[PDB]
Write a protein that binds this ligand. Structure first.
Ligand SMILES: O=C(COC(F)F)N1C[C@H]2CCC[C@H]2C1
Ligand SMILES: [Zn+2]
Ligand SMILES: [Zn+2]
Ligand SMILES: [Zn+2]
Length: 459
């Protein structure tokens, strides 16, 4: 049981309005055949156009919600809608494009999918809420066959060109006209009572139905993400490295050590309440403080209520000392906190649009994150950049341009001149910091946090 068998049944009920008289008994094998695709018994890595829910989750980065609306059936024009917000009108002679033939529409489809997916995935997964027209229209922009490699590289083939008779991946597909060997999943096959809007609206207020095909494409992919990442959570599924994942994670660990170490020196809190990851370790192992840990998994639905995390009877006194919420998303942070909160609005290859304003952050693992809300941080202030060091000024072992900064909290800068070692360390840390900030993480601290209190820690 690795792939979805072509002899598995397909419920055709949601298909009988666009396709009246459709057989109740239907398989993937009969469906694909009906759609105009000859599989020809092929053992070349393409067993089925349709995929399992587990395979769809593994290839979430590849998801594109797709919906076709019968605008007026080879006699009438079709409105193609994609979760990218695009709307194409195809004729058989929220970006709403006018009526054009299939030969020109298919070119735009390859451009759009290639530009959206090149940095994200090795494939496309057409996420559907199948009513009939989306499956009839696939023969006009899709070609299938044995699994292939790009004509210009070693990545797997995702497009095809009828002009040059060649294949290409998402990167080298300029001028290509066919979507080669795509994947798809029908969300209606998962046992839903009622239509798309009714089921989507149960979990999301952010996507509205303007009645265009792209709105349904967005609601479909949203509902698919809710089902697989919000209500169901699988943190065992690993995901490929497609960006700055290792530098972002390394930066995160450096920023946390720094920020937490400095707060303990500036305000000498006797106790630290570490609320978050049940698999966490002391980020400042040599600190004087009393480290008390409290397990809390990453919330994927709605941000935790601070009342339910702390109260109902542990130190019990969370007001004693400082609270460290490192990626533990709560509705309103106490005033004595140090917080790292991922901003779901950040635009990146790691961040995918989520459910109810939240986002799917995929970095080694998929984490659906609740919508960033600026009000969560009313009793806190933004933590400013600073680099603190108590290490000796010793170069050991790159070139040098004198460093001048007010945010380099070191003994050398106290003395009047920053040494080469602390200048390399400051610049390296500022890069890790800028990396982590740009990757969408925001840092917040208690209002009394003053870096002026760190200069006295060398006496
Ligand atoms: O092949 C077609 C369109 O008709 C043909 F004559 F062009 N289709 C695609 C399949 C979708 C399920 C029912 C099938 C109808
Ligand atoms: Zn290529
Ligand atoms: Zn939604
Ligand atoms: Zn120094």
């Amino acid at each position: 049981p690795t792939h979805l068998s072509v002899d598995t049944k397909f419920k055709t009920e949601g298909l009988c309005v666009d396709i009246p008289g459709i057989p109740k008994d239907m398989t993937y094998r009969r469906l694909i055949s009906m759609m105009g695709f000859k599989m020809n018994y092929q053992v070349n890595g393409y067993p089925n156009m349709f995929i399992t829910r587990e395979e769809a989750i593994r290839h979430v980065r590849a998801w594109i919600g797709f919906d076709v609306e019968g605008c007026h059936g080879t006699n009438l024009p079709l409105q193609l809608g994609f979760s990218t917000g695009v709307n194409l009108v195809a004729v058989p002679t929220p970006l709403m494009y006018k009526g054009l033939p299939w030969n020109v529409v298919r070119i735009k489809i390859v451009q759009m999918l290639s530009d959206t997916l090149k940095n994200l995935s090795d494939r496309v997964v057409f996420v559907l809420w199948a009513h009939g027209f989306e499956l009839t229209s696939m023969k006009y922009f899709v070609k299938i066959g044995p699994e292939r490699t790009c004509c210009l590289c070693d990545r797997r083939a995702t497009c095809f060109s009828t002009a040059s008779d060649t294949y290409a991946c998402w990167h080298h597909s300029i001028g290509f006209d066919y979507v080669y060997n795509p994947f798809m999943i029908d969300v209606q096959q998962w046992g839903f009572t009622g239509n798309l809007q009714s089921n989507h609206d149960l979990y999301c207020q952010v996507h509205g139905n303007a009645h265009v095909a792209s709105c349904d494409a967005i609601m479909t992919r949203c509902l698919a993400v809710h089902e697989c990442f919000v209500k169901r959570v699988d943190w065992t599924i690993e995901y490929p490295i497609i960006g700055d994942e290792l530098k972002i994670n390394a930066a995160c660990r450096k920023v946390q050590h720094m920020v937490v170490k400095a707060a303990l020196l500036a305000d000498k809190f006797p106790v630290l309440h570490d609320i978050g990851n049940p698999k966490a370790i002391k980020c400042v192992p040599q600190a004087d403080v009393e480290w008390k840990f409290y397990d809390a998994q990453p919330c994927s639905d709605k941000a935790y209520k601070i009342e339910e995390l702390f109260y109902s009877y542990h130190s019990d006194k969370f007001t004693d000392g400082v609270c460290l919420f490192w990626n533990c998303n709560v509705d309103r942070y106490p005033a004595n906190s140090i917080v790292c909160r991922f901003d779901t609005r950040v635009l990146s290859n790691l961040n995918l649009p989520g459910c109810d304003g939240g986002s799917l952050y995929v970095n080694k693992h998929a984490f659906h994150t609740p919508a960033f809300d600026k009000s969560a941080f009313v009793n806190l202030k933004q933590l400013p950049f600073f680099y603190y060091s108590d290490s000796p000024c010793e170069s050991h072992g790159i070139d040098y341009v004198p460093l001048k900064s007010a945010t380099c909290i070191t003994r050398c800068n106290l003395g009047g001149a920053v040494c080469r070692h602390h200048a390399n360390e400051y610049r390296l840390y500022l890069d890790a910091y800028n990396m982590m900030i740009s990757a969408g993480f925001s840092l917040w601290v208690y209002k009394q946090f003053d870096t002026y209190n760190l200069w006295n820690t060398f006496t």
